[PDB]
């Protein structure tokens, strides 16, 4: 895997972000995590998860996306990646706060699965947010 640059256009919620990627606007969806729902007919921690992601990505000097080894888009045309804000993975950062659960683990796009699971287990042990 490798990291590629991208530019924030707009944070939609905890796990979905509009980025300019190779000079094209695209919606990206965070691999291997689910933040609580706030759009579809809002769940506990959804607003919190959304605020966390917005803050973390708006404050970055540099945003990067890292696709995994399989599909690079989902059925909705959203890019599927690990997103990094100044070298810090947003997917991990949410899970580590108990603001997302490890989810949608679809092979072969599971390269950081164990890494994320370890962060979720610490968020659980610490009773944070979703685990409170
Ligand atoms: C994260 C992820 C989501 N999705 C799809 C699965 C879910 O489809 P369905 O809506 O048909 O269940 C939806 C979950 O995304 P959200 O959590 O944004 O709703 O997006 C993928 O297909 N692959 C992925 O890697
Ligand atoms: Ca979600």
117 tagged catalytic:
no
29 tagged catalytic:
yes
Question: What resolution in angstrom units was achieved for this structure?
Answer: 1.6
For 7, the domain range is: 1-132
- CA–CA dist 104, 91 (Å, integer): 13
What approach was used to elucidate this structure?
X-ray
Residues 6 or more apart in contact with residue 117 via CB below 8 angstroms: 102
Residues with CB under 6 A from ligand 1: 16, 29, 31, 34, 74-75, 80, 104, 106, 109
Overall domain count for the chain: 1
| CATH number of the domain enclosing 83 | 2.40.50.90
Catalytic residue, chosen from 48, 78, 92, 120, is: 78
Residue whose structure tokens are 């810090």: 88
């Amino acid at each position: 895997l490798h990291k590629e640059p991208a530019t924030l256009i707009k944070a939609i919620d905890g796990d979905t972000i509009k980025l300019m990627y190779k000079g094209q606007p695209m919606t990206f969806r965070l691999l291997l995590v689910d933040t609580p729902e706030t759009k579809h007919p809002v769940e506990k921690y959804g607003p919190e998860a959304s605020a966390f992601t917005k803050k973390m990505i708006e404050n970055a000097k540099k945003v990067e996306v890292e696709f995994d080894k399989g599909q690079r888009t989902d059925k909705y045309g959203r890019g599927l990646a690990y997103v990094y804000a100044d070298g810090k993975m947003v997917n991990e950062a949410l899970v580590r706060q108990g603001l997302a659960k490890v989810a949608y683990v679809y092979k072969p796009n599971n390269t950081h699965e164990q890494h994320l699971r370890k962060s979720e287990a610490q968020a659980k042990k610490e009773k944070l947010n979703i685990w409170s």
